[PDB]
UniProtKB/Swiss-Prot annotation, chains A, D:
Residues annotated as glycosylated: 9, 50, 147, 179, 212, 282, 467, 470, 499, 547, 550, 588
Species per Swiss-Prot/TrEMBL record: Mus musculus
Residues shown, of full length: 26 to 620 of 835
Protein name: Toll-like receptor 4
Main location: membrane
PTM section of the record: Phosphorylated on tyrosine residues by LYN after binding lipopolysaccharide. Ubiquitinated by RNF128 via 'Lys-28'-linked polyubiquitin chains, leading to proteasomal degradation.
Curated annotation (Swiss-Prot), chains B, C:
InterPro entries, A to Z: Ig_E-set, LY96, ML_dom
Organism: Mus musculus (Mouse)
Tissue: Highly expressed in spleen, bone marrow, thymus, liver, kidney, ovary and decidua. Detected at lower levels in testis, small intestine and skin.
One of the record's GO molecular function terms: lipopolysaccharide immune receptor activity
SUPFAM superfamilies: E set domains (SSF81296)
Phylogenetic classification of the source organism: Eukaryota, Metazoa, Chordata, Craniata, Vertebrata
Residue span of region Interaction with lipopolysaccharide: 99-103
Identification of the protein by name: Lymphocyte antigen 96
Subcellular location, record wording: Secreted, Extracellular space; Secreted
Metal-binding among keywords: no
């Protein structure tokens, strides 16, 4: 009742009203209610019996100290339950009884003491299970995990875990076919009982911020063996006390684990020597993000790397590389200004060098990379890219992208002259005074073109799009065009959109638009049209949308044929009830037109 | 009017906003100086938001002359740097952060800046503060 | 209609202009090709100008479509590179120049370019020529 | 008569008419006639007796085979004579008799055979003397050079000179106080007689394109000794046959000559080892231009260099340097793209890094150069210059210059905050949306400011020029300003020019311009003013110029006070007879104004 409804019987959002009881005035058949910071010192029975389709309930910081025997009596569809902050000294048997289809649980900050006295029992479906910030001391996995045929994540972070024993993970030895990711971050581990991990497989391990001294880490990392994993997360956080010296021999005892993707994170002490340590010879997907590298010099050839990724790492030089097996290199959001240098990578099929102030002088030919079979290129938000040769060795490509980058010398010759297989292109907001015809020459297949900010010669569209048949999405917006030459759009048989707005154009014609067979949407707005001039019948039939808002229409006893054709087909236009007319009589939404 | 530190060449103070009142506890050590300093900053509060996509808005005024507005992303939300940027509603947050800068030439005048913390997708102001700096 | 060389993938020819007739003798060795070539070019004529600030104007037409115009400085006029760019009026000039380029992708069409030599301060056309290229 | 006069009795330019005689119809008291390519098979006597002030005569390719006994009879002021191309088998005594004040001679391509039978004799004044392309075989300097008390250049290039002997230059041994530059370029020298140069001093030597083999050059360069020079010019030309291998030991025997400025030029074979060869330890002004260098690594500290200059040389890296005596470094027109790197030069007072695509990231503080006492800085036509700190160590400067270079982050803080001594500035054509006041803050002395292409916030001038008193030349042109706020130009007591044109401004006011005491010129053109609005009397008295062309003036029976004030003071305006007015009656230069 006193809370703030947003949508009819939906999102009642009854948060932070000084309450002491579930409200009864709430209309039944609601969808998502929300309570929070409301004092409910005790919770009682049957209170939710009325609601029958509530499928998102929240309870957070609602001071709770006990639950009655049956408080979730009738709830058929509740695919959420948050319980954060609620201090429950200890749970009671038979709880959670009524629920039937639950796909989440969040018991965080609950004053929980162990995992064995947790009366989950039989909850046939439970996708996740989140735990953290609790008073747990053990790590044993109880047996009732046998029934929950679907549980694809567990978290035990920020706990008081001290050791690991061979007794734990036993259920894993018994069950070889259980998918379960894991995390034990921020755990003051100082001992691992020998031969703990044996014939075991996971899907994600994670250890960040645990260790304090070097020898301890040496011993622990040594104690592992026989393990089988899919993603390591090693590193530390910049807001605790951590290591003082990183030695490439600290990660000894690692030449025994099977790994498929190593992943490092921010470290205080670092050295170029850490990488290409001989226990990293079979890591099949390298990765590193946030690491304060500075240089990347020669690397042995007897490595098996299928991927590399550098993200947000300082790099004051374009490093040289030679690896006859690497592919899918990625370097983005760099914190410095660099300049391209030739490399050699005989088998690469992905590249992304974006949002770096990268200047590429002798541009885009074979010799800069020495490869074939490239598929995705992206140099966007970079700086000046002097064009020196049209793409000559890279005769196979699929995407291409400049977004905010001054592209120089585009018009002195016909670039893009050899990309016979392309399916996308983007030259937008790159200051480009198009004064040479035949610029978009030679590229047949192109199903997208975005030329938002681009000037023209003496402000006129001039026979640019020729020999560009397959081209469905076109875009010429935001650019000053004071007229249109005769003969554009001659052959665009398949063009299903044409954005043209925010440019000064006193009148428009109907001699154009005459050959577009299948044009669905046609925006022409913010461009102060006075009236048509064509036959007003020669449009294409397969036409469904228009847009004529913010136009200055001559409203003084003239061209009444148009003035009535507008007043007949108000179905295809939009906001037909909102047009005004610009007369010697101003400040009046006069749409009478008595003629 | 809660907290204020006196340094050699700085007077700093803050106070709650006028259309939002959610409590926070913040301070730093030691009272910074307008050249190179090294130190820490303590933080303790209760989220009221997911804090996964957290950033700021700063509106700055250098001696009655306005400037443009500043927006600095603090927690990208994916394999972040800090520990406090993984929290949940109603879960106590408590941490300390180290920092160190160098210093530039600063005019001698009355500064001001208003700082507001914004969530990511449920766009709403988690808190607002008035920061008042005097350089001298 | 004076000189023309036949190469594997090029047909080149030149002839005097229509509003200027001053004789020049020029040719190159060997008949260049539209990819990487190395060779020489011979020059002999009589200045009629100081040749100290000499440059060109090139008006280019790629298969009936115009381009912008090109201007390339050839002798800055101060500690230059070549020897022939220190001459005087009525003084015979005779020299040979080496060159070498690589090649790009060129469309297959009828090119044209008009090339006019301009002095520096007594601006006047020392000579004019019609260059006709066929790439094939 | 039949030739093409240009200026009244001046520049008759009678070139390339099929003549056979000096024309008599030419009006006397002419200044500069010009004959060329006219057939004059013989030249006769007294022909120039009439002309009495002709002071620039040319004769070139005029086929001449003989001269009469007295053909220059009366010529009082002729400070030029060109004779190129004229084949004279041999000169005759007593020629050149009549002339009295000649300051040039050009006998080039003349079929001359020797320098001893040249009947110059007594020509009291002769500044230059050019010779080239002749049949000379010797090198002896005859004795009659004793009388010509002024001759500051000789040239003997492209000749058939073979050796040098101790007998030549004897006149130099006799005369120790004769200034004479020299040149013997393109001379197939293959022997120098021993002890040729002894107790001799010049002002310029020049040798380019002579040598053919290495040992010959070794021996010749060795034979020099005791010499005293002021400028060496060594190198070769890219259109002959020349050396194949350059050894740093070829320039042996050079540790004996005294030198004050070494100057190298283009060379085919080059090595970084050529420089800092131990016989270059006392060259007091290094220089090199056109040399295909690539790197410049460490250089010994026991060098005495006062200057360095690299021009048009490829350089794929910013070289490091440390020389406690070098000053006035210059690097311009580089053929590549580089990036600044810190250096150390404890005493430098000039720098010029212009027309190179140079990116200067951590910009412009002390640590980048490590010096004081800088005087002239120039980074113009470069690329993006991210500003990171206002100039802090460089508290003494005189000029500063950006011309076409995207200057980033200028508005996030008050740059130029410590240049308390400046006298020039140039921020033009650098896209800069000025939206922060107090940008031009802190710099008191500034007697020039050029802000040609710069946008504004919502197109209005807004209180920018304050605390900028001493400022005489100002410039705000070519930038779109749709109005002017009230209060600009408050304190510009000394401002003697104000360019404001090519911007849209419907009307102008007289409330401005009210405090400029000494404003001489005031352009306001191309900006479609309709009429003033002020009292039309409140202008400054010390005002002399205006400019009102291309303005749309309301010409329909209104604001006639202005329409008459324009028609009264037609002295201060320009082209007052050329104004029209824009009425319902168009296409008429109606300046009647009957009121
Ligand atoms: C450091 C390391 O363990 N490298 C191994 C190598 O010993 C083994 O021969 C190869 C094939 O199994 O896989 C990898
Ligand atoms: C290479 C060479 O000649 N260096 C000389 C050095 O021998 C001499 O001591 C010094 C002072 O005269 O001038 C320099
Ligand atoms: C195992 O569980 C993870 C949990 O996210 C899931 O991503 C992965 O696809 C699962 N593996 C299989 C084979 O389904
Ligand atoms: C790290 O080790 C030091 C030295 O033994 C000890 O003083 C400190 O308490 C340890 N800290 C942690 C977080 O274990
Ligand atoms: C057309 O482009 C404008 C440019 O801002 C955009 O706002 C509008 O949504 C577009 N209309 C379409 C794509 O139908
Ligand atoms: C019509 O133009 C308006 C103006 O912005 C735009 O908001 C709207 O999306 C357009 N509608 C269509 C159907 O394109
Ligand atoms: C926050 O952490 C600090 C770390 O020293 C601890 O001293 C403090 O007790 C914590 N917060 C509270 C409310 O105590
Ligand atoms: C606090 O900030 C507001 C702007 O949100 C400002 O109007 C107010 O003046 C500030 N408080 C004081 C005491 O100035
Ligand atoms: C031009 O120089 C060449 C160099 O071989 C020479 O053969 C030729 O004779 C010179 N010119 C003339 C007109 O001979
Ligand atoms: C020679 O050049 C002129 C332009 O200067 C051109 O009009 C003419 O057609 C050219 N000659 C031929 C044969 O085309
Ligand atoms: C010597 O003659 C040269 C010739 O140009 C001149 O530049 C120089 O100033 C003269 N030296 C003196 C001391 O006049
Ligand atoms: C250079 O020396 C070679 C070999 O002795 C000789 O054949 C040639 O004529 C010489 N050329 C010149 C220009 O002296
Ligand atoms: C004012 O600036 C314009 C800009 O092109 C220039 O043409 C004109 O000569 C200038 N007038 C002066 C400096 O008096
Ligand atoms: C007046 O403006 C014209 C227009 O270009 C310019 O040519 C001329 O120099 C100006 N005159 C003065 C006195 O500034």
């Amino acid at each position: 009742n006193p809370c703030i409804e947003v949508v009819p019987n939906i999102t009642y959002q009854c948060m932070d009203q000084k309450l002491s009881k579930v409200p009864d005035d709430i209309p039944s058949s609601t969808k998502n209610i929300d309570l929070s910071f409301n004092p409910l010192k005790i919770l009682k029975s049957y209170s939710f019996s009325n609601f029958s389709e509530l499928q998102w309930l929240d309870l957070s910081r609602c001071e709770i100290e006990t639950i009655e025997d049956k408080a979730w009596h009738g709830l058929h569809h509740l695919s959420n339950l948050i319980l954060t902050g609620n201090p429950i000294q200890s749970f009671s048997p038979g709880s959670f009884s009524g629920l039937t289809s639950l796909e989440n649980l969040v018991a965080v900050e609950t004053k929980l003491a162990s995992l064995e006295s947790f009366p989950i029992g039989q909850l046939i479906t439970l996708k996740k299970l989140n735990v953290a910030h609790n008073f747990i001391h053990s790590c044993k996995l109880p047996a009732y995990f046998s029934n929950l045929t679907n549980l694809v994540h567990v978290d035990l972070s920020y706990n008081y875990i001290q050791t690991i024993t061979v007794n734990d993970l036993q259920f894993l030895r018994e069950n070889p076919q259980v998918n379960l990711s894991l995390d034990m971050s921020l755990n003051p581990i100082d001992f691992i009982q020998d031969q703990a991990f044996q014939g075991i497989k996971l899907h994600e391990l994670t250890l960040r911020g645990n260790f304090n001294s070097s020898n301890i880490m040496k011993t622990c990392l040594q104690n592992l063996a026989g393990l089988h994993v899919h993603r390591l997360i090693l590193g530390e956080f910049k807001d605790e006390r951590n290591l003082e010296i990183f030695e490439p021999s600290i990660m000894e005892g690692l030449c025994d684990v099977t790994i498929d993707e190593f992943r490092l994170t921010y470290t205080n002490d670092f050295s170029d020597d850490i990488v290409k340590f001989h226990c990293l010879a079979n890591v099949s997907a390298m990765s590193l993000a946030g690491v304060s590298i500075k240089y990347l010099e020669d690397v042995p050839k007897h490595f098996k790397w299928q991927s590399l990724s550098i993200i947000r790492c300082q790099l004051k030089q374009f490093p040289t590389l030679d690896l006859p097996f690497l592919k899918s290199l990625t370097l983005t959001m760099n914190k410095g200004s660099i300049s391209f240098k030739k490399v050699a990578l005989p088998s690469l099929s992905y590249l992304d060098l974006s949002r770096n102030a990268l200047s590429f002088s002798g541009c885009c030919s074979y010799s800069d990379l020495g490869t074939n079979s490239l598929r995705h290129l992206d140099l966007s938000f970079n700086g000046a890219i002097i064009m020196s040769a049209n793409f000559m060795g890279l005769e196979e490509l699929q995407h291409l992208d400049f977004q905010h980058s001054t592209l120089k010398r585009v018009t002195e010759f016909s670039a893009f002259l050899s990309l016979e297989k392309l399916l996308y292109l983007d030259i937008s907001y790159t200051n480009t005074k198009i004064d040479f015809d035949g610029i978009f020459l030679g590229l047949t297949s192109l199903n997208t073109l975005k030329m938002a900010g681009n000037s023209f010669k003496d402000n006129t569209l001039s026979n640019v799009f020729a020999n560009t048949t397959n081209l469905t999405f076109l875009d010429l917006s935001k650019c000053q065009l004071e007229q249109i030459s005769w003969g554009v759009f001659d052959t665009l048989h398949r063009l299903q959109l044409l954005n043209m707005s925010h440019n000064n154009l006193l009148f428009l014609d109907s001699s154009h638009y005459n050959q577009l067979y299948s044009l669905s949407t046609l925006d022409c707005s913010f461009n102060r049209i006075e009236t048509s001039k064509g036959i007003l019948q020669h449009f294409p039939k397969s036409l469904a949308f228009f847009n004529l808002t913010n136009n200055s229409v001559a409203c003084i006893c003239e061209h009444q044929k148009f003035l009535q054709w507008v007043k007949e087909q108000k179905q295809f236009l939009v906001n037909v009830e909102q047009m005004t007319c610009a007369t010697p009589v101003e400040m009046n939404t006069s749409l009478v037109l008595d003629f | 009017q809660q907290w204020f530190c006196n340094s050699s060449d700085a007077i700093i103070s803050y106070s709650y906003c006028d259309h939002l009142k959610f409590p926070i506890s913040i301070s730093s050590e030691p009272c910074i100086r307008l050249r190179g300093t090294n130190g820490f900053v303590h933080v303790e509060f209760i989220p009221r938001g997911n804090l996964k996509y957290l950033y700021f808005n700063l509106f700055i005024s250098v001696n009655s002359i306005e400037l443009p507005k500043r927006k600095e992303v603090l927690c990208h939300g994916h394999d972040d740097d800090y520990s406090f940027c993984r929290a949940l509603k109603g879960e106590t947050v408590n941490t300390s952060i180290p920092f160190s800068f160098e210093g530039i030439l600063f005019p001698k005048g009355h500064y001001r800046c208003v700082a507001e913390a914004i969530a990511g997708d449920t766009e709403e102001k988690l808190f607002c503060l008035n920061f008042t700096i005097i350089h001298r």
